[PDB]
Structure to design on (673 residues):
C-alpha cells in the first residue's frame, strides 16, 4: 500500500540511454520490498514554455538547465516504455496545458502537480478535464488555496493526494517541517496524504518520521552518478534509495499495526507475575463474605488466586468452601453476591 | 515541553551511594537540553508486599531481586533529596497503599502507575486520594479498562498521562508497536500521551517515532555500569541516555511546529522562478480587457509581471496603459 515515487526530473541529463540505465538501477534498489512504486517525469513544451524573450539566456535560474536537457516526445515515450517495462507506475508532472495532452498520448497513469503550478489555475482546469488520479504538492501554498484546490478537485470526484514539501533545494534538517504532514492529514479527511522531498544527503530518519505521521506516498529525486555525469545535492543514487526504503521498512515494523488491541501471551503472564494477590488474614468459613478485615493484598499470586485487580471494596464474594488463614483466596472457591 | 522520566527501578542495586552516583551521572547526560526531567523510584513496602508464603524464595521471578535490593525509607528519602538537588522532578511508582503514604511523606511530586497495577482498584482508590499528577502505564490493558481508569481519574480532577508500553523486557524491535501511541492519542483526546519503553540495545529511532506521534512524556530505565555492578538489557547507561535525548531533540528539529504557517522568502522566491508569467500575444490598447485571445503563458516571470497563478476565471483585467505584443503583462499596468 505505501507508494514510493522516483523523480527523474531532468536528471536523465538530456540523454535517454542514461535514464534507461537509471530506471534499471532504481529497480535493482527495490529488490525485496513490498510496496508500490512509481517513476516520475517532468513535461514542459519547451517551445511554448520558455518565452522568446528568455531563449538562450542564463542571467536567470532554470532557463539554461531546461534548454540543455531537452528531450523530444519520441524519447519521452521511450522512457515511459521502460518505466512500465520494469513495473513502475508511470507518473508525470505537466507544466503546460499541451503537456497534459501529451501525458494522455503516452498513456501515463498519474498526474503530479508541482508546487509552483499548484495555483496555476488554467493548468488546473486542463488537468480537471482529465480522468487520471492527481498528486499535488503544496510547498508555500496558502491554506485558502489548498482548500480551493482540494474542494474543487474532490467535487467532481477526483482521486486526490496531497503532499507536504518544502521548496528549498536542498532542504536543511532544521527546515523539513515534517509536522506539516499531520497538519495536512487533520485538515483534509479522505484525501491521501504524502511527502515529497528535497532533503537528501542520505538522511534516513525523515522518512521514518514521515511514515509515523501517516503519510502513504513518498517522492524523492533520483539520479545515477557516473564518470562524466554528476549528481545534485537533493537527488539520491541507487545505493541511497535502497537505504531509503530500508528505513521505511524498519519504521513500519517498529510501528506495528495501530489497529491491534490484541494481547501477547508473554505480556499476560509477565503482568500477572507482578500483581498483588488476595490472601485471607483470618479463617473464612463457608458462606462468609470476604471483607477488608479477613483479606489482605500481597504479591505474587499463584494461578488462579484472586488478585487485587479484581477486588472491589463493596461486598462481591462469599466463600463457597472455607478458606484457611494466610491462604491464597482461589477464585474458583467463590460464589458472587 | 517534553518530559523525560528516568526509571531507576532497583538499579541502585540496593546501595544508596551508587544510586546517588547514578542520579549524578544522569544529570550530566541532560546538560544543554530544554526539556523537563524527572527521576523515578519504585516504592513497595516489602515487609507487607511480599507475602510470607513467598519470603526467601527464588522459585518465581522478582521476589529475590526485590529482597536483595531492599532500601529503607531513610535511604529512599536520601535519593529523593538527591534527585531534587540536581533539579529533577521527583517521581514514583507506589505498588501498595503504604507506599502512597510514603510518597506523600517524602515529598515526591508525581505518581506513576505501573502496567501491572493499572487495574489495582484498591491501590487506585488510594492514589486518587493524593493531589499529585498521575502518570499511568498501559501495557496489556484492554480498552474497557483504560476507559474505566481514564474516566475514574478524569472525573476525580486528576492531571493524567497515559503511557504506551509493552511488557517484554526487553521489547524486540519487531514488537515495539509504536503506533499505539497514535491509537491512544486518538481514543483519549485531550489526555497527555507518553511512551515508556523497554527497548534499546542502543536504539535511537523509536523515540524519534514516539515524538512524531505526539507523545510528550517519555520514560526509560537507567543504570550506571560499574564492573562492581553490571546493567540489564532494557536499561540505559549515561552515555546512551544523552544519545537518546539527542535523538529526541533532532526529531523535534526535523518536525518543527505544526501550527506555524509562515512561509519563507527563500521558498516564496523559489516558487516564483518556476511559474508561468503572462505575455501579451497582440498589442493591447489602454483600457482594453485581457482575455485568452490576447495572452500566452510562459516562463519565467520578472518582478512584478502578472503570473497565471493570478489568471482566475473570477478576475477581470483591463490595461491602464498600452501593452506591446510579445511583452510581459506588468501588474502595475492593470485594474482589479
Ligand atoms: Zn521536486
Ligand atoms: Zn518498567
Amino acid at each position: 500500500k505505501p507508494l514510493f515515487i522516483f523523480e527523474m526530473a531532468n536528471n536523465h541529463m538530456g540523454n535517454v540511454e542514461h535514464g534507461v540505465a537509471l530506471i534499471r538501477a532504481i529497480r535493482e534498489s527495490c529488490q525485496g520490498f513490498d510496496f508500490d512504486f512509481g517513476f516520475k517525469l517532468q513535461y514542459r513544451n519547451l517551445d511554448t514554455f520558455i518565452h522568446s524573450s528568455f531563449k538562450g539566456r542564463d542571467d536567470v535560474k532554470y532557463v539554461k538547465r531546461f534548454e540543455e536537457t531537452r528531450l523530444q516526445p519520441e524519447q519521452m515515450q521511450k522512457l515511459v516504455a521502460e518505466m512500465k517495462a520494469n513495473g513502475f507506475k508511470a507518473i508525470c508532472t505537466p507544466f503546460d496545458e499541451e503537456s497534459v495532452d501529451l501525458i494522455e498520448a503516452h498513456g501515463i497513469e498519474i498526474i503530479k502537480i508541482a508546487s509552483c503550478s499548484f495555483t496555476d489555475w488554467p493548468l488546473l482546469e486542463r488537468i480537471a478535464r482529465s480522468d487520471k488520479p492527481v498528486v499535488a504538492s503544496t510547498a508555500g501554498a496558502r491554506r485558502e488555496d489548498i482548500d480551493k484546490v482540494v474542494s474543487f478537485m474532490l467535487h467532481r470526484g477526483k482521486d486526490l493526494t496531497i503532499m507536504h514539501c518544502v521548496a528549498e533545494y536542498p532542504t536543511p534538517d532544521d527546515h523539513l517541517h515534517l509536522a506539516r504532514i499531520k497538519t495536512l492529514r487533520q485538515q483534509y479527511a479522505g484525501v491521501r496524504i504524502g511527502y515529497s522531498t528535497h532533503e537528501d544527503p542520505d538522511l534516513m530518519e525523515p522518512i521514518m518520521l514521515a511514515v509515523a505521521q501517516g503519510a502513504t506516498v513518498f517522492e524523492k529525486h533520483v539520479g545515477l552518478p557516473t564518470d562524466q555525469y554528476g549528481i545534485n545535492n537533493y537527488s539520491a543514487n541507487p545505493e541511497q534509495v535502497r537505504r531509503w526504503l530500508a528505513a521505511a521498512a524498519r519504521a513500519l515494523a517498529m510501528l506495528g499495526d495501530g489497529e491491534d488491541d490484541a494481547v501477547s501471551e508473554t505480556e499476560q503472564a509477565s503482568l500477572r507475575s507482578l500483581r498483588r494477590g488476595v490472601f485471607a488474614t483470618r479463617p473464612v468459613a463457608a458462606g462468609e463474605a470476604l471483607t477488608a478485615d479477613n483479606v489482605s493484598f500481597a504479591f505474587p499470586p499463584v494461578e488462579g488466586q484472586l488478585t487485587a485487580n479484581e477486588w472491589s471494596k463493596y461486598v462481591r464474594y462469599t466463600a463457597k468452601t472455607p478458606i484457611a488463614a494466610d491462604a491464597p483466596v482461589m477464585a474458583a472457591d467463590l460464589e458472587p453476591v
